[PDB]
Design a protein around this ligand. Structure first.
Ligand code: B12
Length: 577
């Protein structure tokens, strides 16, 4: 009764490590301890060798992320046993290097940084994760104290880009010398070479994914390829730098007043917006069982680095089988979470009477539309357009002057407040696998709540599409009437606008959701936005706007021209200043 459970205790570890088995991992690492001269030996011995096998099958394309991080669980759960033994010992082993990783200040994204983290650990590297929303002061202070070999920053939203710039400028002022690694959603080879590097004398390198990271950190910590690398990189960032400064034959921008004039052309007198069936703010609720169906799995696989749209991905050649397994692993947790009620999604919805006024939407106390209680600000496209209107989300709402009764909604949902706790429980058991899963699922559940809610709105709450019966795939295709733009996307860049959503719906109190200094939401698995009904509305990108609109927007927002320039950095069609 065994078979594999009968080879050399070292052939067992190295094996269980690859296959990712954890039910003999305790006694297998123990027996290999008593049989070793000193604790640390089991590390560079069976464990080390085993991991290499993973890195190998990884490159050939046999193993994928899911397994790698699943093997990491073994690697870690093993060491976790060798803590006292490896500690109460003499020389306690070496590493390929130590790195301080952190999600920049004001940002809450971390799954990606987690992936990059574990991967680097599966390559015998020390990683001190400083978590999220970490000030550059802490990052550096820590890099100093722990004497890290390099610093790595991660970001998801726009505010983050500037924050990384800060850290660069800081490391430069504090006379740092180690290389600065930058990554995450918003980070791009472009921005990392036109708005960051020129701030730090040390080597600043951008990296697209966890995989390539090991490559970069390799040379960067190599007494050989280091110079050659940085040199090629510096000269490489210079090229992309001048290329993003050739000012190609673009279309001449237009004045703010010129744009507004070419606003959405629509006969409002002949049109009568659908009246809101249920005005006011309500707290909505849906179980995991209710939202699963509304989950869009394609993104989920992307989080585990398995390309291919779902479900076509399941029958894929190269990564089909693993995709199948991950999905199954995923759903089993959802079944658990749904049963035990350990993760409960929450949300608040609200419909209000409104009307358009310029590039803004006026929210009123009641239907008498005599008292403005809030104002949704929006920007407008400022490129010379012909035959097409200079799009603005506000245009899709009947203007005060048209005397037409129009409306606007707002929402805020989450996969559950417990997201953070559930993950911590895993970190505690050195289970990064399930830790990454719960967060990935929390997110899939948040977005699902979003889809579900928007439906319940069109159908019930706002009730303009009662006879709507679209399929999950059609929902993914957005094949319904009306949009639900969310502050952050190109349709509405201004992030600080989520404040108005919090104020209006009283998010904090109905869901427990909050906003941070950088206007980030917590829990991370969170979605908030508006609800337009107009059948001609779309997610038109604001694009590059000019100085005149910034000043004007600044006046309506009651913010400093400098402030809005920070928040709308990515859309500054003029000299960023
Ligand atoms: C999952 C996701 C979410 C989640 C939560 C994320 C979280 N908080 O963990 C949900 C659905 C809940 C969500 C919400 C929001 N989202 Co969102 N989201 C995504 C999405 C669909 C997928 C990509 C993804 O995030 N990948 C998994 C991650 C975390 O991996 P990664 O970051 O890409 O990491 C890889 C590398 O970059 C690298 N890496 C990571 N860090 C580091 C560090 C170092 C040092 C190194 C070398 C490498 C490295 O390794 C990874 C490879 O393994 C994208 C679309 C897209 N395709 O870009 C938008 C996107 C990132 N989201 C966006 C925005 C607009 C929002 C919201 C503001 C919307 C709202 N509701 O109001 C909020 C976020 C605020 C909040 N919650 O606090 C934008 C950002 C635009 C911007 N503003 O600059 C995007 C690009 C969408 C768009 N088209 O505009 N989102």
């Amino acid at each position: 009764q065994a078979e594999w459970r009968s080879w050399e205790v070292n052939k067992r570890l190295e094996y269980s490590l690859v296959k990712g088995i954890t039910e003999f991992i305790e006694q297998d690492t123990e027996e290999a301890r008593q049989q070793a001269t000193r604790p640390i030996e089991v590390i560079e011995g069976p464990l080390m060798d085993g991991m290499n096998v993973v890195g190998d099958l990884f490159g050939e394309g046999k193993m994928f992320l899911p397994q790698v991080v699943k093997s990491a669980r073994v690697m870690k759960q093993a060491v976790a046993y060798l803590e006292p033994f490896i500690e109460a010992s003499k020389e306690q082993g070496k590493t390929n290097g130590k790195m301080v990783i952190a999600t920049v200040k004001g940002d809450v994204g971390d799954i990606g940084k987690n992936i990059v983290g574990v991967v680097l650990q599966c390559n015998n590297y020390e990683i001190v994760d400083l978590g999220v929303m970490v000030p550059a002061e802490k990052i550096l202070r820590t890099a100093k104290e722990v004497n890290a070999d390099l610093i790595g920053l991660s970001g998801l939203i726009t505010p983050s880009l500037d924050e990384m710039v800060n850290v660069a400028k800081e490391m430069e002022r504090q006379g740092f010398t180690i290389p600065l690694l930058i990554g995450g959603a918003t980070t791009s080879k472009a921005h990392t070479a036109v708005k960051i590097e020129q701030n730090y004398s040390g080597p600043t390198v951008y990296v697209q994914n966890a995989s390539r990271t090991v490559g970069v950190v390799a040379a960067l910590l190599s007494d050989t390829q280091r110079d050659d690398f940085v040199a090629r990189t510096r000269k490489e960032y210079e090229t992309v730098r001048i290329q993003h400064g050739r000012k190609k034959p673009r279309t001449p921008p237009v004045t703010l007043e010129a744009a507004r004039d070419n606003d959405f052309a629509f006969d409002w007198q002949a049109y009568t917006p659908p009246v809101a069936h249920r005005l006011g703010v309500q707290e909505v609720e849906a179980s995991i069982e209710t939202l699963r169906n509304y989950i869009d799995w394609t993104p989920f696989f992307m989080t585990w680095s398995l390309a291919g749209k779902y479900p076509r991905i399941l029958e894929d050649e190269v990564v089909g089988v693993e995709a199948q397994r991950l999905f199954k692993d995923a759903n089993d947790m959802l079944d658990k979470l749904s049963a035990e009620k350990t993760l409960n999604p929450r949300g608040v919805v609200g419909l209000f009477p409104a009307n358009r006024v310029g590039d803004d939407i006026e929210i009123y106390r009641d239907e008498t539309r005599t008292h403005v209680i809030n104002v949704s600000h929006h920007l407008r496209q400022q490129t010379e357009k012909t035959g097409f209107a200079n799009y603005c989300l506000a245009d899709f709402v009947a203007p005060k002057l048209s005397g037409k009764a129009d409306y606007i909604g707002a929402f805020a949902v989450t996969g559950g407040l417990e997201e953070d706790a559930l993950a911590d429980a895993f970190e505690a058991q050195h289970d990064d696998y399930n830790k990454i899963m719960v967060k990935a699922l929390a997110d899939r559940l948040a977005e699902a709540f979003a889809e579900y809610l928007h439906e319940r709105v069109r159908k019930v709450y706002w009730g303009y599409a009662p006879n709507e019966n679209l399929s999950n795939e059609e929902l993914i295709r957005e094949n319904y009437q009306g949009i639900r733009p969310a502050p952050g996307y190109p349709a509405c860049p201004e992030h600080t606008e989520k404040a108005t959503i919090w104020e209006l719906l009283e998010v904090e109190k109905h869901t427990g959701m909050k906003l941070t200094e950088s206007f980030a939401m917590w829990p991370g698995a969170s979605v908030s936005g508006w609800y337009f009904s107009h059948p001609d509305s779309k997610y038109y990108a604001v694009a590059q706007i000019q100085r005149d609109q910034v000043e004007d927007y600044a006046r309506r927002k009651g913010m400093s021209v400098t402030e809005v320039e920070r928040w709308l950095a990515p859309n500054l069609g003029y000299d960023a200043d």
